[PDB]
Amino acid sequence: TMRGLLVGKMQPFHRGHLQVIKSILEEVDELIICIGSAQLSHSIRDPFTAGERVMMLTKALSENGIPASRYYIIPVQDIECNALWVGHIKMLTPPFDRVYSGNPLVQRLFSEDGYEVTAPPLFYRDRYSGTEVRRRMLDDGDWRSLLPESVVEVIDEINGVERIKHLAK
Amino acid sequence: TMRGLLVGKMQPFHRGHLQVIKSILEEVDELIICIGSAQLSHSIRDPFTAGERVMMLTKALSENGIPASRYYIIPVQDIECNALWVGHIKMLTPPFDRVYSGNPLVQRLFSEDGYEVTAPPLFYRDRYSGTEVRRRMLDDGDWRSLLPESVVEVIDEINGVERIKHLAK
Amino acid sequence: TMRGLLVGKMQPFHRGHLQVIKSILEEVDELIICIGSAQLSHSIRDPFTAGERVMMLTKALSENGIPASRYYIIPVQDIECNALWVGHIKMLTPPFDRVYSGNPLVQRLFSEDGYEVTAPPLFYRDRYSGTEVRRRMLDDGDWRSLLPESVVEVIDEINGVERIKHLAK
Amino acid sequence: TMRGLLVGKMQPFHRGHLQVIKSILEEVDELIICIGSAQLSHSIRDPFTAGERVMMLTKALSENGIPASRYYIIPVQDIECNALWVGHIKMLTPPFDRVYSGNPLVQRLFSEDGYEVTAPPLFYRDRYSGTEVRRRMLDDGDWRSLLPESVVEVIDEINGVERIKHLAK
Amino acid sequence: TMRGLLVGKMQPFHRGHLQVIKSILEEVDELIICIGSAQLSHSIRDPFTAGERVMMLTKALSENGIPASRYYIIPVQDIECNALWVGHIKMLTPPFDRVYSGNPLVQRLFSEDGYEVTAPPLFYRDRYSGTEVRRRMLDDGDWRSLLPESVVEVIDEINGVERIKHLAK
Amino acid sequence: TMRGLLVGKMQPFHRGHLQVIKSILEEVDELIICIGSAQLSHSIRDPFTAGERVMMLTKALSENGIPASRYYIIPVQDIECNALWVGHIKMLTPPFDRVYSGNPLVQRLFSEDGYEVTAPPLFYRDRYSGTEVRRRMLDDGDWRSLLPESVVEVIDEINGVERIKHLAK
Ligand SMILES: NC(=O)c1ccc[n+]([C@@H]2O[C@H](COP(=O)([O-])OP(=O)(O)OC[C@H]3O[C@@H](n4cnc5c(N)ncnc54)[C@H](OP(=O)(O)O)[C@@H]3O)[C@@H](O)[C@H]2O)c1
Ligand SMILES: NC(=O)c1ccc[n+]([C@@H]2O[C@H](COP(=O)([O-])OP(=O)(O)OC[C@H]3O[C@@H](n4cnc5c(N)ncnc54)[C@H](OP(=O)(O)O)[C@@H]3O)[C@@H](O)[C@H]2O)c1
Ligand SMILES: NC(=O)c1ccc[n+]([C@@H]2O[C@H](COP(=O)([O-])OP(=O)(O)OC[C@H]3O[C@@H](n4cnc5c(N)ncnc54)[C@H](OP(=O)(O)O)[C@@H]3O)[C@@H](O)[C@H]2O)c1
Numbered sequence A, B, C, D, E, F: 001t002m003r004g005l006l007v008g009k010m011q012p013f014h015r016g017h018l019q020v021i022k023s024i025l026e027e028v029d030e031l032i033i034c035i036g037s038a039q040l041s042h043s044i045r046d047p048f049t050a051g052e053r054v055m056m057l058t059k060a061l062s063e064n065g066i067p068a069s070r071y072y073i074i075p076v077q078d079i080e081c082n083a084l085w086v087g088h089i090k091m092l093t094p095p096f097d098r099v100y101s102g103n104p105l106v107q108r109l110f111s112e113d114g115y116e117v118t119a120p121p122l123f124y125r126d127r128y129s130g131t132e133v134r135r136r137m138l139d140d141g142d143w144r145s146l147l148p149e150s151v152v153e154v155i156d157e158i159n160g161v162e163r164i165k166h167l168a169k
């Protein structure tokens, strides 16, 4: 069994993240999806809690027909020591074989620990990114179009737009 | 949507835990399953990591035909302040309505925070419990019979029996 | 018994803070006063320890004829998870009914937890603020005029001016 | 100004603690009263939160004719390093001169740091201990007689008896 | 360059520890010596601080003619997650090849991370151990005979005997 | 015995640091050398782990004819409370008499705790700084000339240049 790993803040989970996930699932048996910076919530850049993001991913991956047997969703708090972060991930996850990341630090930390590291198979443009999603939430743009409908439903239930607007005042 | 919550160490996940989960799913729409004491591993009482237990639950719940849309699996480290533990759970989980626990502390902490609390719908006997599973792993008893086959496969992959035997020497 | 809560760094406690406190005491029976960022000391923005600020508040509130039965003074360290901060405050304080804050994050965190939140009854201008107090301490301005005399006496005893001047070299 | 320091769990604050405090106030100008093991709540031995104990002390000291100018009340969480605990206390408190404790560890830690240390001036009777108070709360004995009435009122408001009884099931 | 690693509380450093270290230096180029449980001090089982033990080791290894080029002395605080402890050690130490330990948990943690692990080359009897050293310090036995003289000198300077006797009252 | 203390990030240890250390050793019997910000690694400003820097210092001091009896090397992680940092250092170090630092915060923290504080006896040339060393590692300049050869050997073994280059992409 070949297991990949992906790590991102996913503030919130959007269609781009999902496109990337589906591409990775073409080349691994199972994908471990880590929600990074799980300690951060209630800011403009990081509005949603770990739990809210777990909810987003769980609903979206189940809405899009990906069998439950092919993924794991794990929240991962940041830690002060970069030299321990890979060990931290490892403790919180199933065993894995390959890490997907475009980030130089994430790449180098995993490489130094002996893991195979590769760039994600797809890169999405800025206008589909979290920055754009959050800006549209703030400015009454079309944020819903950038998310799976299951994520929209989460954001509606948790009053996510109201939160981010209040925090920006 | 009515969401229940359950919390246990699940060292390891066994058939009893699963029986209880299925009973709860008769009376809630979705169940949030928290893996408690997620910081504890590599002892006789707590042999498996957070990640290994996430793997166990993920594989078992998917093996037994429970749709992914009906549950969430979340590791929860213990914390030094009992008065903060419910807040800690809340941050790490989707919103929920009702807590299932037989434990007086867990009950009282959740009750004081305004949640509905009830006992689990089923109680399994000691001979099906984690204590018995771990004893059988140590003593070459029939531990496999007490677990879903998907969990057995996890324990085989992570060399769980070898670990617990070494730790007991 | 109707209890309010206020939270601020109070670096140091000045006449503006006191004016606000007295206005709040017109509309609550008791006021819980939390010294925020209690972990921060010995910087230009945050010169004084938690203990020094406890001393400042204790002396000032006693000097100004407010009965001891009407307030509580509690140091509160910041924490990494915004989603837990209200729980953290709750553990450290008596039960309370209403929060007074002008800060959007503090407001939203408390409102999400179900508390009534309102702006402070008074807003003081910048020239009476901590920034101005600290600048005057550094530049040999009239910092004493901005503080209750009881706070001046604390600052003299702990060599606060000497400290901030050394730190700014 | 001569300042004493006292530290205790005060689970809960009882008439004994108050007798000792009054006795110390005959020998010092001001007393810093620290609530130790502030992180512990919701157990049989340590039922009450830091905030609940702050409330108990604040009410009791104000309702017994001790002027506010003569004391400070500070919650102090335990920490893993004994060699840092005096530094921890110091950060959280006004400057002080003398420590009152009968505990050999507390005495030695403070003595090593250069503080004068002395035993409490009074040893209260066996009836006034926290063990007895908590037993009576559990067994429907006369716990109220062992406490200042202001502390009784706190225990009523926070449902302290109901908590301890539930926890003991 | 072949580097070994050893880890122990060394409360205090005694002749037995030194005998073992010298035996290990027969089979490695350099030895990384970690002072475990570096957070623990001022108890009967763990009387000495991390710094005091660093001093003990530094002086003893220098007194006994072992060249400085052949060892490293590193204090290592315990951590709550066993699954991260090897990563923690790795961050704090030079790169190493082999671990020497008789402890089943230490062995298994390092073996799971891919290190070669072996028992120490020598086992000393109980009458030469830390337990015996500390008992003799308490009971006015011949503790000095169990230590290198350089360690005795550290213990005299830090008033170690006085400390342990006070703590035992 | 007169013991000095020095603290620095030493990212990496260079000929300047060694010049200063030798200069201090003219004025004290023994020098405690603390590696500050020990938690920081794998960034452009702080590339090396605590362990890698311990290795650098251990090798450099042993390869320059300083007797082992004259120094101690101790990693010190930063902590959130400035008011505890001196206590933190003290716990981790042998007893000391005098602190050498040009940093206003370090000076004031130690001075407040009653230590003698003095500036380092030498200020090394601009060429020997860590900023320059790291720039040269990145830009294929002559970084080796700025370091003791023993430190070069450490940087080669740990692939320090490859790390810093990858991190800068
Ligand atoms: N010491 C530690 O604790 C430590 C060390 C290393 C990393 N980490 C954590 O690891 C997590 C991941 O690190 P990261 O640097 O990747 O952070 P990140 O914030 O999750 O991602 C960085 C940026 O890349 C974007 N992105 C990701 N995949 C993309 C793709 N396939 N195509 C286009 N854009 C893409 C993200 O876009 P969106 O805005 O659309 O999401 C984001 O803007 C973080 O939570 C970080 O804190 C922690
Ligand atoms: N401050 C804090 O951090 C804090 C506060 C409260 C609770 N917690 C955590 O919350 C988690 C859960 O607490 P817990 O007391 O329930 O611990 P637990 O160790 O998960 O469960 C206690 C015992 O009950 C058994 N059990 C559970 N459900 C049962 C059922 N339906 N029928 C029969 N036996 C059953 C378990 O059996 P098995 O051996 O078969 O699993 C175990 O022996 C723990 O990880 C605990 O540490 C943390
Ligand atoms: N995750 C967490 O730990 C967390 C989350 C939320 C908040 N907090 C903490 O909560 C504390 C309070 O938050 P805060 O944002 O209010 O910080 P703050 O540092 O206390 O100050 C807010 C700003 O508003 C000013 N101010 C306050 N009341 C005023 C009034 N009535 N009129 C005019 N100006 C007024 C203060 O002035 P002065 O300079 O005169 O004081 C300061 O400049 C902080 O310590 C923060 O760190 C922590």
Ligand SMILES: NC(=O)c1ccc[n+]([C@@H]2O[C@H](COP(=O)([O-])OP(=O)(O)OC[C@H]3O[C@@H](n4cnc5c(N)ncnc54)[C@H](OP(=O)(O)O)[C@@H]3O)[C@@H](O)[C@H]2O)c1
Pocket: D007, D008, D009, D010, D011, D014, D016, D020, D035, D036, D037, D038, D077, D078, D079, D080, D081, D082, D085, D102, D103, D105, D106, D120, D122, D123, D124, D125, D128, D129, D130, D131
């Ligand atoms: N590293 C650390 O974090 C660290 C290090 C040292 C100490 N501490 C903390 O410091 C606190 C102080 O320790 P402690 O053991 O004294 O706390 P404690 O829980 O108050 O224990 C003292 C015991 O003696 C009793 N007592 C105290 N003063 C008395 C008097 N004058 N007459 C008669 N009986 C008296 C108390 O009775 P009652 O039951 O009636 O109260 C209690 O049973 C603890 O919270 C401890 O954890 C922490």
Ligand SMILES: NC(=O)c1ccc[n+]([C@@H]2O[C@H](COP(=O)([O-])OP(=O)(O)OC[C@H]3O[C@@H](n4cnc5c(N)ncnc54)[C@H](OP(=O)(O)O)[C@@H]3O)[C@@H](O)[C@H]2O)c1
Pocket: E007, E008, E009, E010, E011, E016, E020, E035, E036, E037, E038, E077, E078, E079, E080, E081, E082, E085, E102, E103, E105, E106, E120, E122, E123, E124, E125, E128, E129, E130, E131
């Ligand atoms: N999660 C974590 O933080 C974690 C995980 C694993 C281990 N650790 C730490 O790692 C450290 C070392 O673990 P440990 O179990 O070896 O603890 P330890 O306290 O150093 O002692 C192990 C026992 O074996 C004895 N001993 C050691 N070497 C011996 C020899 N060659 N012959 C005879 N007796 C010998 C020691 O005797 P003496 O009394 O003479 O010293 C002690 O009684 C501890 O500080 C532990 O806390 C931490």
Ligand SMILES: NC(=O)c1ccc[n+]([C@@H]2O[C@H](COP(=O)([O-])OP(=O)(O)OC[C@H]3O[C@@H](n4cnc5c(N)ncnc54)[C@H](OP(=O)(O)O)[C@@H]3O)[C@@H](O)[C@H]2O)c1
Pocket: F007, F008, F009, F010, F011, F014, F016, F020, F035, F036, F037, F038, F077, F078, F079, F080, F081, F082, F085, F102, F103, F105, F106, F120, F122, F123, F124, F125, F128, F129, F130, F131
């Ligand atoms: N609360 C806390 O945790 C706390 C509080 C206070 C301090 N600290 C820690 O203490 C450490 C010490 O602070 P620091 O700013 O001095 O560290 P630092 O990173 O070594 O900064 C000193 C700067 O001055 C240079 N320098 C030092 N001594 C010199 C000399 N004799 N001649 C010429 N240049 C010299 C260094 O050069 P190079 O680049 O060549 O090294 C560096 O650029 C830090 O790690 C800090 O975080 C922590």
